[PDB]
Design an enzyme around this catalytic site. Structure first.
Site, PDB file in Angstrom:
ATOM      1  N   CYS B 149      25.973 -40.145 -25.531  1.00 24.98           N
ATOM      2  CA  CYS B 149      24.675 -40.093 -26.202  1.00 24.98           C
ATOM      3  C   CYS B 149      24.491 -41.248 -27.194  1.00 24.98           C
ATOM      4  O   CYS B 149      23.496 -41.975 -27.129  1.00 24.98           O
ATOM      5  CB  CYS B 149      24.527 -38.745 -26.905  1.00 24.98           C
ATOM      6  N   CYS B 154      21.147 -40.716 -25.274  1.00 27.29           N
ATOM      7  CA  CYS B 154      19.940 -40.291 -25.990  1.00 27.29           C
ATOM      8  C   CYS B 154      19.440 -41.321 -27.008  1.00 27.29           C
ATOM      9  O   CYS B 154      18.225 -41.513 -27.151  1.00 27.29           O
ATOM     10  CB  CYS B 154      20.171 -38.952 -26.716  1.00 27.29           C
ATOM     11  N   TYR B 291      16.061 -37.197 -14.666  1.00 25.11           N
ATOM     12  CA  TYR B 291      15.390 -37.593 -15.903  1.00 25.11           C
ATOM     13  C   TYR B 291      15.840 -38.975 -16.365  1.00 25.11           C
ATOM     14  O   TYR B 291      15.037 -39.718 -16.946  1.00 25.11           O
ATOM     15  CB  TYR B 291      15.580 -36.534 -16.996  1.00 25.11           C
ATOM     16  N   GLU B 295      12.966 -41.837 -16.980  1.00 25.24           N
ATOM     17  CA  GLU B 295      12.891 -42.305 -18.359  1.00 25.24           C
ATOM     18  C   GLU B 295      13.112 -43.813 -18.443  1.00 25.24           C
ATOM     19  O   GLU B 295      12.382 -44.517 -19.159  1.00 25.24           O
ATOM     20  CB  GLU B 295      13.914 -41.556 -19.217  1.00 25.24           C
ATOM     21  N   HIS B 566      -4.744 -27.137 -37.406  1.00 27.79           N
ATOM     22  CA  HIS B 566      -5.798 -27.981 -36.847  1.00 27.79           C
ATOM     23  C   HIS B 566      -5.970 -29.216 -37.718  1.00 27.79           C
ATOM     24  O   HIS B 566      -5.995 -29.098 -38.948  1.00 27.79           O
ATOM     25  CB  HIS B 566      -7.130 -27.185 -36.778  1.00 27.79           C
TER      26      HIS B 566
END
Ligand SMILES: Cc1cc2nc3c(=O)[nH]c(=O)nc-3n(C[C@H](O)[C@H](O)[C@H](O)COP(=O)(O)OP(=O)(O)OC[C@H]3O[C@@H](n4cnc5c(N)ncnc54)[C@H](O)[C@@H]3O)c2cc1C
Ligand SMILES: Cc1cc2nc3c(=O)[nH]c(=O)nc-3n(C[C@H](O)[C@H](O)[C@H](O)COP(=O)(O)OP(=O)(O)OC[C@H]3O[C@@H](n4cnc5c(N)ncnc54)[C@H](O)[C@@H]3O)c2cc1C
Ligand SMILES: CCNC(=O)c1ccc(NS(C)(=O)=O)cc1
Ligand SMILES: CCNC(=O)c1ccc(NS(C)(=O)=O)cc1
Ligand SMILES: CCNC(=O)c1ccc(NS(C)(=O)=O)cc1
Lengths: 588, 588
Positions: B149, B154, B291, B295, B566
């Site tokens: 990673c 990642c 993935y 990616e 919101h």
């Protein structure tokens, strides 16, 4: 219980059918109403645990215990053979339109709550009117249908916030390898206003289309409730007249306040004026310290403005004060100046606004600090953000009997009922409620379903999450830390916290220990999460999902056992461990 | 039994004190151990609901029922008077360091799981060694401490994803009023790689500093388990020796596969090589559809590349296929080409990589479609992303008796224990578990706590949330739609869904109906939420918080009664109402 529910539902529904999904007689009535374009509520008795009792109770109104049974405005109309007879004899249309009043519902106010309520009611066959009028600001600013959030609130504020965020994106792009030079790029205010206003205009139009396609009558007229069932309207030509409705929903919202000092109304503006201003404000003073004050000061500085905020006492009164101070420190570190413990005494005009050349004027602001020292400085624009207030004296005759509190807001039961039994209030004017657009929308939709479709679900106003869209955003859900300690005592409160750095900030060379998050928990209730707070990018996206978990009663254990998504900012909530009582530093 | 938990805790802990918070004798023992710099676990009996029974069971080891009681590696050492006698006689340091093995714990593998396990164990006085070695890629790429990673996973992937996102930010900025012209801006690959590699180097150095500050021995050496307690190490000068440990944690991870075709190893690369590549890949073919493949293809296209993806069968096998198809459609509309139903046959070299002028070579790729037609096209870079696998042959001798599955992954109990009682496995090599960095970290820290501090908490591997960082990101938690239908039947499944449009996309003139979200629910269980899916910006921030609510058993009613924030993308989850069974369109 059942019988009391059935009577309220029959009495106030406009058109309602009692039915079963398996019954071909009910299906034949459904087909006839659909063909004649008659909208109505439907209650399917076979899908309710106590349909048997309800079926029995219907006989107290119709003297039959079978399905279907159709009602109009509290009156039993007939079973299958009777409805078909009225249809075949050209009699059904006139029966379903018979009423004591012009409308089943009159909504006064066409904003977040009122538009939501009116469209929902019309779904169930209630004959609905929505009134909306926008009193111009002191300089004449006005706008279209949709209320404060659409026209001069959440929508244009977040778009200008995004224009401000993109300035840091332009800086960050150099470090990630893009060939631009941020130092040679500038911002054009009026180009941005044109694009914002073009999207707002599409919203104005979209709401008028939606009321048309739901058969709601829209009157661009100022309304005044003069008796429980009578609304006086005044149109654009000053023609006065009166309409009647069974149910009334008050949804008129608030407007900005001005301080009572010379020069304020004449030479300052508010947020009502800012989002359509034809010229860039220039060197700007923002008076006040609400979230409106800080959000506006924030994006004006990111777009190149010289900006000062004048703070009477503290920032973000009513929000967690440790978080508020972190918010303000970041703005002060990225260009915003603060005049703390200071109030204005007068605004003097040095130049008039130049409509011709499209440029601001010039003002002299005099004030004083709480120790008596003097404030005096020149600004091109002065924005007042010192609170908002309803003006119900303009909406509501005192003789109707609708009770107000000491702030002028409407006192309502937990089902939005005022002191007058057919009259309700929703949105910002409902006393004691969080003043937010999604709250107003949920309250109005849920109320319309109870009035006209037999629903029972109430709006839950507790633990409603918020986000402040300052240059570094602040999201929160639940109690502040000082409120939690006041309610339960310091020994019963544990706080877990940590700093963090977004991975996106690393290559961009941004700050190491500015973003921050904490969970405020109750020891004696299995470490229940009482409040959640986060300062950092995309704080509204971060916070939303956790609000479902807090609504369900999440504890610190529930956060620990859930696994994080990597690499995100939000994952830091799943591995918190440093407590404030331990004294261990929260840095990374 | 309380008794058999106590027996396992005493046998396995390195140094453990049984104590009470109110006792001044336990206080003096803690201070002595602190002054002697002796780290240990502590069990505070007055804070456990059955500390009474535990006190009684301690008599079985020490013949005393009072507190404090100190143990070292399964042996009772003494009460307050005895520990102080050892200290003032300079016998304590020798007593706490006496052991049958060189180490209490040897970790093989210095990545996400292994570093987290090793640091956690050392806090409780376990004497710990962490072994890490990076076998180079076929072209000789290598890197530092921290695992897949940190170095080739990642971290660099999401930083280059962010570089790609900044391209759309440059285009958006013009619409929001900034004066730049996106068309005259270009990207420099090597500048980005330098910034990315500089951050990775700071993490390499950080982990070395972390291990030293926790008294953890770090050996940059390849480790091999040859018997339950013996680890054979080979250093950088080929020197071979043996060290012994009580507990062993295997945490060696995986590496990318190559397809068995001519030219692949010789002339292709993988993700291992991409993140430090010294030249821009140029015109690129990515082979595969996981993935990792999508990616990498996505950010390469956003940085200006000419990019093709060769897909054997489907995109994102094992993920919700409706979502996978939406992910790929967005990519195909925004510049990524796809050669569908296609596999490669051979890679031929046309031009060697130019190390000096920092330029890629040139390749001819040959393949064919599942119907029989031919594929032939030139590319400068070919990237394989066709899966990853462990090589536990290199790690573990067959004779030790650690059972593997048919894929080569270690078969473990629900507490990470192998078929050999003192050997555990964590992370990507643990069979059947989700292969994610936060899973490996949680498994590692929780395992360390059970071995050396008497903890009992297990890692929960169910409903772990995920995010695929394609150009439009895709977040998920729980079951795909097809998996829920298979498990429960179509009539028992209800799906609520909606398109949405980010407010930020309005002024920027981006697409109205590409972002999409859905909730997969079980009718017969109170409309339990079985899976959540969202395609949109910041999808990992959106998803993370709902993972806590899903862990707690959220239903649709829980999502409905919670109020939205919101304006956000995530608030659309709080007002979903269109079902797939109804056939109503989900567009906005
Ligand atoms: C600058 C600013 C930023 C904000 N940002 C956010 C945010 O990010 N998120 C959030 O959730 N909330 C935000 N809010 C709050 C939000 O605007 C309000 O909570 C919401 O609009 C209240 O809706 P409402 O239906 O109660 O009233 P309104 O939306 O104000 O609508 C009431 C309408 O009734 C009309 N009216 C008044 N009197 C009469 C009359 N006599 N006859 C006919 N019509 C009449 C008014 O002109 C208005 O159009 C913000 C507010 C401001 C001022
Ligand atoms: C391109 C890519 C992108 C990814 N993106 C994400 C993401 O966004 N989010 C996410 O959660 N996961 C992501 N992952 C997966 C994540 O990286 C892994 O799940 C994680 O690294 C697993 O950690 P581990 O401790 O099991 O093994 P690793 O982190 O691979 O560490 C094992 C270490 O042991 C070393 N080693 C091996 N054999 C020996 C030996 N005999 N002696 C000594 N040392 C040895 C290895 O060289 C390595 O240093 C991604 C993976 C890839 C390939
Ligand atoms: C000449 C105008 N003078 C005033 O004192 C004034 C009027 C209305 C205000 N607000 S409003 C638009 O009714 O919402 C504020 C101030
Ligand atoms: C379409 C709008 N209807 C509703 O929201 C609704 C109405 C009644 C319900 N239940 S009851 C037991 O009859 O009171 C449930 C839901
Ligand atoms: C900080 C390291 N300790 C732990 O994680 C831990 C250990 C035991 C517990 N409970 S017990 C005594 O087994 O009943 C609780 C927590």
């Amino acid at each position: 219980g059942t019988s009391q529910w059935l009577r309220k539902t029959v009495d106030s529904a406009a058109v309602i059918l009692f039915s079963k999904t398996t019954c071909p007689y009910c299906k034949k009535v459904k087909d006839v109403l659909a063909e004649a374009k008659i909208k109505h509520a439907t209650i399917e008795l076979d899908q309710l645990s106590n349909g048997s009792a309800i079926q029995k109770c219907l006989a107290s109104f119709s003297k039959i215990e079978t399905v279907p049974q159709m009602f109009v405005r509290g009156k039993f109309i007939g079973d299958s053979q009777t409805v078909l007879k009225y249809y075949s004899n050209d009699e059904l249309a006139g029966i379903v339109n018979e009423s004591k009043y012009d409308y089943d519902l009159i909504v006064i106010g066409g904003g977040s709550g009122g538009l939501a309520a009116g469209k929902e009611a019309a779904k169930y066959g209630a004959k609905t009117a929505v009134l909306d009028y926008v009193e111009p600001t002191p300089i004449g600013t006005t706008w279209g249908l949709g209320g404060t959030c659409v026209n001069v609130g959440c929508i244009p504020k977040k778009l200008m916030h995004q224009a401000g965020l993109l300035s840091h994106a332009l800086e960050d792009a150099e470090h990630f390898g893009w060939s631009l030079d941020r130092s040679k790029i500038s911002h054009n205010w009026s180009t941005m206003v044109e694009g914002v206003q073009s999207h707002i205009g599409s919203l104005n139009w979209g709401y008028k289309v939606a009321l048309r396609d739901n058969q709601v009558t829209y009157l661009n007229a100022k309304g005044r409730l003069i008796s429980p069932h009578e609304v006086q309207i005044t149109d654009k030509n000053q023609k006065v007249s009166t309409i009647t409705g069974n149910k009334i929903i008050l949804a008129t919202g608030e407007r900005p306040k001005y301080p009572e000092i010379p020069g304020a109304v004449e030479y300052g503006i508010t947020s009502d004026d800012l989002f359509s201003l034809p010229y860039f404000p220039g060197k700007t003073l923002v008076i006040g310290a609400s979230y409106v004050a800080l959000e506006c000061a924030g994006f004006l500085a990111s777009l190149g403005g010289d900006v000062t905020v004048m703070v009477r006492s503290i920032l973000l009164r009513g929000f967690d004060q440790q978080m508020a101070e972190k918010v303000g420190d970041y703005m002060e570190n990225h260009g915003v100046k603060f005049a703390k413990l200071c109030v204005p005494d007068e605004i003097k005009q040095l130049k008039v606004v130049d409509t011709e050349n499209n440029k601001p004027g010039l003002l002299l602001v005099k004030g004083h600090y709480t120790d008596g020292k003097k404030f005096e400085e020149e600004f091109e624009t002065v924005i007042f953000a010192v609170g908002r207030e309803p003006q119900l004296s303009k909406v509501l005759c005192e003789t109707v009997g609708v009770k107000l509190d000491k702030n002028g807001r409407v006192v309502c039961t937990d089902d939005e009922q005022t002191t007058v039994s057919n009259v309700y209030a929703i949105g910002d004017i409902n006393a004691g409620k969080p003043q937010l657009t999604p709250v107003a929308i949920q309250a109005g939709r849920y109320l319309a379903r109870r009035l006209f479709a037999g629903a029972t679900e109430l709006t839950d106003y507790s633990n409603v999450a918020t986000t402040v869209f300052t240059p570094l955003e602040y999201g929160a859900c639940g109690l502040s830390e000082e409120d939690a300690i006041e309610k339960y005592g310091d020994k019963d409160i544990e706080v877990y916290h940590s700093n963090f750095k977004p991975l996106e900030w690393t290559v961009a060379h941004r700050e190491d220990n500015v973003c921050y998050m904490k969970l405020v928990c109750r020891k004696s209730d299995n470490m229940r999460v009482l409040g959640l707070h986060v300062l950092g990018p995309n704080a509204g996206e971060i916070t939303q999902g956790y609000a479902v978990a807090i609504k369900m009663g999440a504890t610190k254990a529930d956060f620990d056992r859930t696994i994080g998504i990597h690499p995100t900012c939000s994952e830091t909530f799943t591995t918190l461990h440093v407590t404030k009582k331990s004294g261990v530093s929260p840095i990374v």
